[PDB]
Ligand binder design. Structure first.
Ligand SMILES: NC(=O)c1ccc[n+]([C@@H]2O[C@H](COP(=O)([O-])OP(=O)(O)OC[C@H]3O[C@@H](n4cnc5c(N)ncnc54)[C@H](O)[C@@H]3O)[C@@H](O)[C@H]2O)c1
Ligand SMILES: NC(=O)c1ccc[n+]([C@@H]2O[C@H](COP(=O)([O-])OP(=O)(O)OC[C@H]3O[C@@H](n4cnc5c(N)ncnc54)[C@H](O)[C@@H]3O)[C@@H](O)[C@H]2O)c1
Ligand SMILES: NC(=O)c1ccc[n+]([C@@H]2O[C@H](COP(=O)([O-])OP(=O)(O)OC[C@H]3O[C@@H](n4cnc5c(N)ncnc54)[C@H](O)[C@@H]3O)[C@@H](O)[C@H]2O)c1
Ligand SMILES: NC(=O)c1ccc[n+]([C@@H]2O[C@H](COP(=O)([O-])OP(=O)(O)OC[C@H]3O[C@@H](n4cnc5c(N)ncnc54)[C@H](O)[C@@H]3O)[C@@H](O)[C@H]2O)c1
Lengths: 248, 248, 255, 255
């Protein structure tokens, strides 16, 4: 298919991979809702992108906020066809460090799980109901949901336990959610990015091309997933063939 | 090595796979601490297992409770050599069901993540500090940590999104935690069981042997991991070659 | 935005198995999008008729992928006709259905059936890779330092092979296994290496099969394989990876 | 507790590659634990001397795993000596280090090097499987319905192959790929099929290598491979799976 006329809700849409996705899709004729925190810069980004883009302030961990954002999307554009989960946070903290006597805090683990994993699920479960209102297309499809994991789901480095747990959870739930939503024609896919230039040594680690990924390359893969009706239930690494070393 | 004289803390040790693990290890001359909820039956199980087994009441989601349980283990047996994470819960709930108009609750997702994933991490981070007090053995080893994932981490069924997210998180953090703890000689391994006869159609789904797994077979694999010094950073499926169908 | 090739227009692709099925669909899409295609397929295939239908930007190169001499001949033909080769797509393949051992019948999988499937599917793919890599290595790099991109065809059988699929699954698991080391070998000279693992597609290789796919519940359309090929060529950051294209299917044992 | 075989004592194992390295370590452990071992290895190996050292419960069966006739001869020798075969362990294997293409040197991987590694490592393992499965199929089932267990040797190169490892990684990825379909083929007759993927072990196949392993930071001891073999034989519920035995290593590209 083509993305012209589709309505996309993009979490984390004020910055980075989410913003690059919004820019590409709006440039291809889609409408976009940037779902991001208050004072994320989302309003100014939506204004810059023109009248087919609006900002919906929301914390993905809040049922009430996501409900409000989806009602805003419905009032503005009439339907939701695509959801892209880019909202996320990171921490670097070792499980335990004997030399320094330091133990990872429980709260640092919980915070990253809540935003990255529970937040993605919260958006999925609520947007599925919105997509379920669509009449199926000629191929039976009502929507497409795309999540963002990380190569840390597969080769987490020293200090990445919390982040890797959160992203490994995204990977683990991709297939069951695709199976849950198959009877109503919503595809569910995940991208696992490597190292991307969002907000020299890191670049040199990538086999080829030997640079950070361009956010537009993430946006290109999102578009390819929306366009290809047979991509479902899968995780795609987008990473220049990197495999992460253990680090320190 | 042999397990005789080792001290194991076994979460979920009052029932099922954890109890089978305690029974085997105590039978092989190890000491065991059954870490499980109040009114789980843990006290009666510890009494039945004899004077090298004690019950430590604790909720794995509580820092205070796990701290208390580990201090109990230290006071009783002097050290901790092995931790086995079996504490866990389940739910069956579809992400969204159009026919019935039902959406998975946020709380059902959060509850399963908290016990299965955050609870395992809470035990890991605190037991690592305890193991760090041990003098390394002749091969540099201070401890062994074994987690329980599930084949649902890889092929979650309809209704298993929350459970699969939790277990996929266990899988995802295995390698980074092994990397974090490598400098101090604590190995970190995960078992992904298939279908086990803990608390006819399900049995017929297993290729060979065509039955539910015996909890003693999980306990045997735990012992094999403790005994083999070169198993680290890996997930082992224990499942009779099953691959789960989507279900309904 | 980092300088790179983000278009198939003007590129030249050598497509093994190009006379039929997934390879033919790929040739059709790429020629329609402004690329040139060389259909590398067996002399007894319909490749010549297919290349004529596709017009002046498509030619047939007869070759058995298991032969060093034949692949060399095909690549020299490609260079003579179109010059620079930018893309290689490995679709040449065969299948067998044969149980390892069947006690009821007292029947053992033949060694020759295993060898033949390995030779065409795995060794033939490597033969094409090693020779096209040498050709691509002579290319002046593009604006993003790239000299080529190579796309292989595995199968979901590499991950969930069914009863009777031992030989086919071995061959496609080999494809999966070598994707990363070959991407690593060729990274210093700017050749990306990627693999697609299709599920069940409506080619001459293939209702009950359609019903096992979660969504959409049908056989894949060869045009959808071709679309993913084009997406890989146009995305400069996809390298060293296997992508399942399968409607979320996970194969049960079968019989 | 479900009735099953949970001991190696009294079992007979055919071990390919048994004259050296991981296969020899496996034979040593199993014979010490009360099993009988047949070392299936090349006629120009030291298998006879090794079998003599191991005593009356170990014999040498000369054979090239790539030959149907040789493997048939070895299995008939096993049956003549010990009767029933309960276990097969595939350790026979070779390696090559050769880049797909090297632009600086103008050097291309030879087709014959790829073919030879595939033939020994992948086709040879299948040849042994298909023939020993037929032998095991004649066995009266044990107390848990089992007629055999087959254990193969892959490598972590199946998942993270390095520069120069394309051929080896293809062969070991094939082993990984066929593990599940063969387990599915043989499930109705009670033969389990499992694979071990070793990291880096101190055999005649092999300080800097030791330093890459997270913990323990050393080469694996062949005795640790043997211990995992015994654990798989003794655990009735391990089937259709690949187990990494590797100290948590994940291989970087190398050069
Ligand atoms: N950049 C990388 O190298 C990289 C690599 C792998 C994966 N990722 C993942 O990609 C996704 C996007 O990352 P990015 O690099 O674009 O980061 P970014 O920081 O540029 O953008 C993340 C956005 O998410 C928003 N956000 C954070 N918490 C939120 C919440 N609770 N509710 C709503 N919005 C929230 C932020 O305000 C921000 O605008 C994340 O999931 C990240 O983990 C990034
Ligand atoms: N039985 C199976 O088929 C199967 C399959 C795959 C994975 N698993 C996993 O194996 C592990 C053990 O399962 P089981 O079958 O033995 O279950 P079980 O119900 O018999 O035992 C689980 C134990 O965990 C305890 N527990 C629950 N929440 C706790 C908490 N917050 N703090 C401390 N203890 C807590 C329970 O009281 C109980 O004694 C779980 O992680 C489960 O998800 C089981
Ligand atoms: N169709 C499917 O459901 C499916 C699923 C997964 C993977 N695949 C794979 O996709 C690829 C394409 O399959 P298809 O469905 O298009 O099959 P197809 O039979 O339509 O096309 C395969 C082509 O390969 C050619 N070929 C065979 N042996 C050759 C050799 N030695 N040298 C040169 N060419 C040779 C054939 O002549 C034919 O034109 C194969 O690798 C196949 O294993 C197909
Ligand atoms: N040592 C390692 O670091 C390592 C790591 C991963 C995997 N492996 C694999 O483990 C297995 C055992 O390797 P090893 O380290 O013990 O090597 P090794 O060289 O010590 O032993 C291999 C044995 O296989 C035999 N063999 C070779 N070709 C044969 C043939 N055609 N027929 C019969 N026997 C043949 C050899 O004669 C030799 O005795 C191999 O499959 C190897 O690829 C080894």
């Amino acid at each position: 298919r083509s993305v012209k006329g589709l309505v996309a809700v993009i979490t984390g849409g004020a910055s980075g991979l989410g913003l690059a996705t919004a820019e590409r899709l709006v440039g291809q004729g889609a409408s976009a809702v940037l779902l991001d925190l208050p004072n994320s810069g989302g309003e100014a980004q939506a204004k810059k992108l023109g009248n087919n883009c609006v900002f919906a302030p929301a914390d993905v961990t809040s049922e009430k906020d996501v409900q409000t954002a989806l009602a805003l999307a419905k009032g503005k554009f009439g339907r939701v066809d695509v959801a892209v989960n880019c909202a996320g946070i990171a921490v670097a903290s070792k499980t335990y460090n004997l030399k320094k006597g330091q133990t990872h805090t429980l709260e640092d683990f919980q915070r990253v799980l809540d935003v990255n994993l529970m937040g993605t699920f919260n958006v999925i479960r609520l947007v599925a109901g919105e997509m379920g209102q669509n009449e199926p297309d000629q191929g039976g499809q009502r929507g497409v949901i795309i999540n963002t994991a990380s190569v840390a789901a597969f080769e987490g480095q020293v200090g990445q336990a919390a982040y890797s747990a959160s992203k490994g959870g995204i990977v683990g739930m991709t297939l069951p959610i695709a199976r849950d939503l198959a009877p109503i024609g919503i595809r569910v896919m995940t991208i696992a990015p490597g190292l991307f230039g969002t907000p020299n040594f890191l670049a040199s680690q990538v086999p080829f091309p030997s640079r950070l990924g361009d956010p537009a390359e993430y946006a290109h893969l999102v578009q390819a997933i929306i366009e290809n009706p047979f991509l479902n239930g899968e995780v795609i690494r987008l990473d220049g063939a990197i495999r992460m070393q253990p680090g320190s």
